[PDB]
Design a protein around this ligand. Structure first.
Ligand SMILES: Nc1nc2c(ncn2[C@@H]2O[C@H](COP(=O)(O)OP(=O)(O)OP(=O)(O)O)[C@@H](O)[C@H]2O)c(=O)[nH]1
Ligand SMILES: Nc1nc2c(ncn2[C@@H]2O[C@H](COP(=O)(O)OP(=O)(O)OP(=O)(O)O)[C@@H](O)[C@H]2O)c(=O)[nH]1
Ligand SMILES: Nc1nc2c(ncn2[C@@H]2O[C@H](COP(=O)(O)OP(=O)(O)O)[C@@H](O)[C@H]2O)c(=O)[nH]1
Ligand SMILES: Nc1nc2c(ncn2[C@@H]2O[C@H](COP(=O)(O)OP(=O)(O)O)[C@@H](O)[C@H]2O)c(=O)[nH]1
Ligand SMILES: [Mg+2]
Ligand SMILES: [Mg+2]
Lengths: 427, 35, 31, 426, 73, 32, 11, 426, 427
């Protein structure tokens, strides 16, 4: 059983820069790539005494790529898995979809082809990209399209960074996000939303860092991925695989948008503050102070929830905890499913990266849920899309590349039909 | 080429084997009365 | 390798000897 | 002589059976390396039922493991008493169905079940006189539900004149692992009512309750639950492996317990199960055993029998005891709580006694009840099924694979007609 | 516990060293030494040796039935 | 490849039928 | 590894 | 008494013969320096069948190695049991054929065959009562096939009353090592049908599949394959070399397996072949050997025999065993799958028992089946031959040496009438 | 078993200069001529503690022969075998075949005659020459002619340098190529050709050497030659001799032209990158990214193939690999050849040269195949032949030597007849 990880965009390779580090420091491999079976899902052992990840970084600017090439993980990633372009799309969907994609994604797909050929028990894929930029949006969708015409039936977990409503770095992000969602609606089988503000609130309140940078963000995101992949990396008492989000989490072929959260997010001294058990993290998994996506689930109703447990976790208390949650009425489910829970238990608790602010916990929970809160977020992004579309802002650069208003119009009609679908299942 | 005739031969053989099965079933169905 | 049992070798036992074991034993006793 | 083959499907079946073979080997005194180390010779004459001698005291279990994910196989071979199974019997796929009954019955079944059918066929022919087959699996998972379901159908099609048990845990709303639990349950019951001879319904909720009240365990992990289930299974099959004053084989149990061919879902109990603190303050008599048997809270199902009537019941006892005391105890318990027993059937209790108790105790008991209260559990799941099927939620992963809606409607009709006949005879 | 987890001193970590003035954020990642305390307490790995030993998943059924009839008399 | 798949299915079907024939013949002999 | 060290010596 | 002289042709024939004399030397207990050091003198009484005493117990194999390239001879003298051959018997050319049957049958034979005929004659009248000859060669290569073919013709012309075994490896499309495989194979068997008494067909594909499934070995070098074929050849000659309860000599097996003079091609299987991890979990009985003998995935040819009918068959057993069990097992496998055998010959199975097992085993068996499934292989060759002959490709290398077209036509004719009579008797 | 190697023209001797270098480094022979049985096929033992190769360098210019005479291999290459002329033919078939050939060829033939008399078990000859020049073409064919009238039945392996279509260093080279092939039709039994651009593409892409010198070129060529002579020099599990290529690779007496390729050409860091095994190199030996001849075999249909394996290799997986290729349909065979492979396995792995850019491998594959791809290349050569033949370009130099138009028209008609045979063999 193996799952491979693909990284498109500056956010993609930076989180992967955190992921694979956390991975080798999870399996005790030095950054040079040699040990001084659980790695088999991510690491293939060339010869003996050297392990290469089942991964690929690819970007358009050569700066951060060569920065990885000259960093400390020179020997870990082998010097051809790092694909690099010449010039950026500069936050342009069409520039990342039509101009440079026809040159880069073909090399990427025949690379990932032999990567899959080298692999034996490929379970699925998982892609890292942020829809706010032009690199991760354009050719990531194209790569996902071409991988769908290549395999299609294999699960393609998309952990995409969504832009915050109030916190914004660029201006064309609603354009790129909607134009990417046009294809992610049909290509991605299970997509996971990730805002940055909610994680900013997390590091402000719980992790109590007053000057946060992308490093700690990428580190915790990596810990989220590690927590959801630990069921395959190690044996647990009750394990679930990557094809479980296929059945358990997606009730309709287009309602695939899941709310992510991770707990307990605890600093060094707060572990002294707090006695860690199961009931409080089961609770803390639901309050909006611990979610990764800015929304208010009190106004939404849950579709289906999944709970990943790492560490010394007996099933009796999680059963009592979900019992208490189901008899409580502060949160409400939808009438479509009486049993909206999916529990999964693993033996290995998460480890600590040195230099991080998270202490070693005896147990952790990774909660991934589905609700209509995301149905409210999509209308919030479409309001900002229509605010700039009504005055024809930034259309001329897409037309200068060669695109038209037809794809913009159908993208607007698809998102509106998607809003109708969320509210329909909400009723 | 040669598989095209071989599949015909195998089809005819399968039909002949079914024809044999019919007679054998009739034989045992006759013997169960005599028992 | 092949270690010796009190009576014979493990791998090699012919049917003739298997039939005449008792006669050989009686002859040895009488000798 | 009498032969029982064992099949373990899915993760639940594999771990339970793992503890099952541990308890079995311990009762027969076989060490984890596979050589006899017991003392009494009563154990030697009755191991042809569960084992085969390979080379000089090395016994191999007569079991078949079947799954789709190698982690289960690793957890089987890693634990104690793991190095005894025959590697041929590890027939095993590679992909994984993953809580998808359609994948468990149409996708990987076509390329895995013929093979496991051949292994079973070889093991069916290696023995002389088949008594029955014994399957253990879950009903919420995919690789256990559909696989075991289709395997049961094929086997019943091939060997229809042999007994068949299946120990299947059913989902509960409070203890709920996956979300398509009704989708799997109602199709599996629809097949098991038409193919399986009789099943023993289990549930994690009642087991968790048992470990909280009677056992007073602090952290009852899955090992202890499987220990309870395995202890139950050994209590079922002790009659074939040991002598006694009144033997009762598997077919003898089914004929005494099944009045009509569709009424074959039993709730099970085991006795004694007392806390380790109060093990000293108690007594060991048959009335002491009986009052612990006929308790509703001692049942291993989430169905209150005092909410219904008992159709038939059976009690398998182990140890030196007085049969008169057993019988008068069953007569008294049938005369006191007379309303809870059905009226138009006299002598609703079957009893048997073996003179070999399990290791560690003096005298044990196993209760098998065919009551009508199980319709509450079937209602409890069918209403969730209709709650999803009223607006076709989560259906498309099964529609897109080949399965259609009429199967669901058949499942509904079959569930409803059975609970209706349970209510009818009530 | 495997030896590499039991002892950190045995896993040599060399961080590319950077000019103090001259210090990008992506270099923060792999420049930090692990310690015995960061090492986890138990490493519950999963041995796929027995499964790798198994042949290709494509099996077969190719035999002639040869069971002595053992009617139950 | 198509005819190859047709062959590898037809042979299996023929084999199952031949096994059924063998079974029937053995039963006929025993009953005789 | 020796070849890589030779590369470094050549550079 | 009865004598078997050995002949090895070509690279494959040399390596096969090397492993063959290795296992036979280990079977008779002689060291790689040529002196006896074994245990039972049952080994001594029948070493004359394969050895001649030189000076003070120096037993040399009665073998003749022959090829055209010295690298094969070096690989022979490199490994152990390479210093026990008489260097006179290394009769050996110098130019090399190079996968050309014409070079191996008209050019190089003209100066090598009188030399090998000298050596084989001296080796023939050296012993008293010749039983026959044993040949190990190929049909795809040049120096083995062509030279051995012409040698067989000369020998059968000189000594018409002695027996003859031919172990010949045939190619397959899946494992196609050289290009002119049909050009050589067709002509070779076209001569074998009139010269050889019987031929034991081999191939590498069946060996690879056997090491895939049954042995579970990682890297099957040629040594292990030659080790298997060698175990086969020791099994086929075990009757002469050891006493038994029912001895079946070479001529005895030939007369039981050859009902028609042109129907003398056999397929072979060897048992038991089990992986080392699963070697511990098995019992060792005659039914255990029988289940592996009649497995169609255990023949050493690429002709799945259940696509045709067995004309006749023979089983050579080694080890102390019940002859009753032996025969009733043969009766059962002949009565159940009765369609797999020919109808107009009752008792299609010739059995034999020898009392001495191969070293390291309890009970072994060698199967030799004369089935009509081999016509699938020959048609599989002839269609390739006609496909090439229609275009006359690679034909100038043959016609430019002395061969003409009518030889190819008669090879086609004999190929076609052979498969026609095989299809007839099916 | 012995074979001698002769080197005609400039190109062949740098091939030999790297070739014999690789041979003495393979057999552990210092460049003074002595070690501190396998050498028998190439080296004869002079007296005691000395080895001389069965080789002749022969050129018309004295400067590069003197380079060999005064290089590092002064004592290895013995000072009389290195034949040298006085003036070059200067890219002229007629001046190399008729003017100075009548003085050089006799000296060469009775030189190799006594070399053959020193030899005992000669398997055949192998030639290293370029047909685009004048020295390799003219007397090279004259030698070949006089070898055929001398021995004839013995094999002549011609490892010639065929010119690249687009990149070329000469002008009259298509005249020289056609006029050499015209005799190479009925002189060479087995003629293996090496384009140079293909080697450029291989070192550019795979070896990623941005500045390739002819030394590296010849290092790779010698790697090919050593990989095909390893069966003679060292014993393997399944050996092949020089006489087999007539029977296995030549379907017709004039269609003897083979596609040559090698795998894996892998740099030092890329060997650290990739886990080399049998399947990928079995695949790698089939794309035009690894061929020594610039042509697209997808446009062609293979006639026969030859696959040499060196090193840690068993026959099981190579039979599995060729099975996958035979069931693949991206590469098609001719209908007259169902069994189109000649494989062989040698135990000893290929060695490395200090100063070279290759790393040592556990296993390598050398492919020599025949296709209709050459059926296209010869038409591409005949076309550019006719473009300058239509206006009588550079023909007066041939007439000034003494040649006429009759053999030009005959060569044109013969090469056209070989083309009809190429089409007739393609169908
Ligand atoms: N959490 C987090 N988000 C990041 C990080 N880096 C980039 N992003 C996200 O990426 C979005 C902008 O796109 P970038 O990743 O900077 O660049 P890009 O996606 O390659 O697109 P171009 O700049 O046009 O080439 C921002 O809105 C961020 O949300 C990071 O390190 N951490
Ligand atoms: N790969 C490779 N090809 C070479 C080398 N040297 C020459 N060639 C080829 O040889 C062709 C020209 O002929 P040369 O070898 O230079 O000289 P020549 O063949 O003796 O003919 P003249 O120039 O008249 O003496 C060029 O087109 C090259 O392709 C070399 O070192 N490596
Ligand atoms: N008693 C027990 N039940 C288990 C265990 N693991 C899972 N289960 C039950 O199995 C049900 C889900 O079955 P699942 O594990 O998905 O089976 P599978 O996927 O088909 O192998 C849940 O209701 C659990 O209660 C275990 O170790 N012990
Ligand atoms: N089992 C086995 N087969 C071999 C061996 N060597 C060659 N072969 C087979 O022999 C055939 C080629 O024989 P070849 O060497 O050309 O015969 P020769 O050239 O006439 O000596 C191939 O198809 C191989 O499968 C070996 O060592 N063992
Ligand atoms: Mg960017
Ligand atoms: Mg020159």
């Amino acid at each position: 059983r193996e799952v491979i990880s693909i990284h498109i965009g500056q956010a993609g390779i930076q989180v992967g820069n955190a992921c694979w580090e956390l991975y080798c420091l999870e399996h005790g491999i030095q950054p040079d790539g040699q040990m001084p079976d659980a790695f088999n899902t991510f690491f293939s052992e060339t010869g003996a005494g050297k392990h290469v990840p089942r991964c690929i970084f690819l970007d358009l600017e050569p700066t951060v790529v060569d920065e990885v090439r000259t960093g400390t993980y020179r020997q870990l990633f082998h010097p051809e898995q790092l694909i690099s372009g010449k010039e950026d799309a500069a936050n342009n969907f069409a520039r990342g979809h039509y101009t440079i994609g026809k040159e880069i994604v073909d090399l990427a797909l025949d690379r990932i082809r032999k990567l899959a050929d080298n692999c034996t028990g490929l379970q699925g894929f998982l892609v890292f990209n942020a829809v706010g930029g032009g690199t991760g949006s354009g050719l990531g969708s194209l790569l996902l399209e071409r991988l769908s015409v290549d395999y299609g039936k294999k699960s393609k977990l998309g952990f995409t960074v969504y832009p915050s409503p109030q916190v914004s770095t660029a201006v064309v992000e609603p354009y790129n996000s909607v134009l990417s969602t046009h294809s992610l609606l049909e290509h991605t089988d299970v997509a996971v939303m990730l805002d940055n503000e909610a994680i900013y609130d997390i590091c402000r309140r719980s992790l109590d860092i007053e000057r946060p940078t992308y490093t700690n963000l990428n580190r915790l995101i990596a810990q989220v991925i590690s927590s959801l992949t630990a069921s395959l990396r190690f044996d647990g008492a009750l394990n679930v695989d990557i094809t479980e989000f296929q059945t358990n989490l997606v009730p309709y072929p287009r309602i695939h948008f899941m709310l992510s959260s991770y707990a307990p997010i605890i600093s060094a001294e707060k572990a002294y503050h707090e006695q860690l058990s199961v009931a409080e993290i089961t609770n803390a998994a639901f309050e909006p102070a611990s979610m990764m996506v800015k929304c208010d689930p009190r106004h939404g109703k849950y579709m289906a929830c999944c709970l990943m447990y790492r560490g010394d976790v007996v099933p009796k208390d999680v059963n009592a905890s979900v019992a208490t949650i189901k008899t409580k009425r502060t949160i409400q489910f939808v009438d479509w499913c009486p049993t909206g829970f999916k529990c999964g238990i693993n033996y290995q608790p998460p480890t600590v990266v040195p230099g991080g602010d998270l202490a070693k916990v005896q147990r952790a929970v990774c909660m991934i849920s589905n609700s209509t809160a995301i149905g409210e977020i999509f209308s919030r992004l479409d309001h900002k899309f229509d605010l700039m579309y009504a005055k024809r802002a930034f259309v001329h650069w897409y037309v200068g590349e060669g695109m038209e208003e037809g794809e913009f119009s159908e993208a607007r009609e698809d998102l509106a039909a998607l809003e109708k679908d969320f509210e329909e299942v909400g009723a | 080429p040669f598989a095209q005739a071989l599949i015909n031969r195998l089809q005819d053989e399968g039909d002949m084997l079914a024809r044999k099965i019919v007679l054998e079933m009739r034989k045992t169905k006759m013997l169960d009365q005599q028992l | 390798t092949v270690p010796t049992k009190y009576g014979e070798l493990p791998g090699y036992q012919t049917t003739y000897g298997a039939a005449t074991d008792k006669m050989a034993r009686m002859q040895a006793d009488n000798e | 002589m009498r032969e029982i083959v064992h099949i373990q499907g899915g993760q639940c079946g594999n771990q339970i059976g793992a503890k099952f073979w541990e308890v079995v080997s311990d009762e027969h005194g076989i060490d984890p390396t596979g050589t006899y180390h017991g003392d009494s010779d009563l154990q030697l004459e009755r191991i042809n039922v569960y084992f085969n001698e390979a080379t000089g005291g090395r016994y191999v279990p007569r079991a078949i493991l079947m799954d789709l994910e190698p982690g289960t196989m690793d957890s089987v071979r890693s634990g104690p008493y793991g190095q005894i199974f025959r590697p041929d019997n590890f027939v095993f796929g590679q992909t994984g169905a993953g809580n998808n009954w359609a994948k468990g019955h149409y996708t990987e079944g076509a390329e895995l079940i013929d093979s496991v059918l051949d292994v079973v066929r070889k093991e069916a022919e290696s023995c002389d006189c088949l008594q029955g087959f014994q399957v253990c699996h879950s009903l919420g998972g995919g690789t256990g539900s559909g696989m075991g379901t289709l395997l049961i159908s094929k086997i019943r099609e091939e060997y229809p004149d042999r007994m068949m048990l299946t120990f299947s845990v059913v989902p509960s709303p409070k203890v709920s692992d996956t979300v398509v639990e009704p989708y799997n349950a109602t199709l599996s019951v629809h097949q098991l009512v038409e193919n399986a001879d009789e099943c023993m319904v289990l549930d994690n909720e009642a087991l968790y309750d048992i470990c909280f009240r009677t056992l007073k365990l602090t952290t009852p992990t899955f090992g202890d639950l499987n220990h309870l289930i395995s202890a139950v299974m050994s209590g079922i099959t002790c009659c074939l492996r040991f002598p006694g004053q009144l033997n009762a084989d598997l077919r003898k149990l089914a004929v005494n317990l099944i009045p009509f061919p569709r009424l074959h879902f039993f709730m099970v109990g085991f006795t004694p199960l007392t806390s380790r603190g109060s093990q000293q303050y108690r007594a060991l008599t048959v009335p002491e055993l009986t009052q612990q048997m006929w308790d509703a809270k001692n049942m291993m199902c989430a169905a209150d029998p005092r909410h219904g009537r008992y159709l038939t019941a059976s009690a398998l006892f182990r140890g030196r005891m007085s049969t008169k005391e057993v019988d008068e105890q069953m007569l008294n318990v049938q005369n006191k709580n007379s309303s809870y027993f059905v009226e138009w059937i006299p002598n609703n209790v079957k009893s048997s006694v073996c003179d070999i108790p399990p290791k560690g105790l003096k005298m044990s008991a196993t209760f098998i009840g065919n009551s009508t209260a199980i319709q509450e559990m079937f209602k409890r799941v069918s209403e969730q099924f209709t709650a999803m099927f009223r607006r076709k939620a989560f259906l498309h992963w099964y529609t897109g694979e080949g399965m259609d809606e009429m199967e669901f409607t058949e499942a509904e009709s079959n569930m409803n007609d059975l609970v209706s006949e349970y209510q009818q005879y009530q | 516990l495997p030896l590499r987890f039991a002892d950190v001193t045995t896993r040599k970590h060399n961080p590319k060293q950077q000019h103090p003035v001259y210090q990008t954020s992506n270099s923060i990642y792999g420049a930090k030494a692990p310690s015995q305390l960061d090492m986890p307490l138990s490493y519950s790995s999963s041995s796929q040796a027995f499964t790798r030993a198994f042949p290709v998943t494509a099996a077969k059924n190719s035999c002639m039935v040869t069971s002595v009839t053992r009617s139950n008399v | 490849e198509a005819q190859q798949n047709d062959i590898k299915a037809l042979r299996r079907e023929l084999e199952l039928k031949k096994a059924k024939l063998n079974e029937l013949h053995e039963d006929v002999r025993r009953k005789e | 590894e020796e070849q890589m060290q030779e590369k470094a010596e050549a550079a």
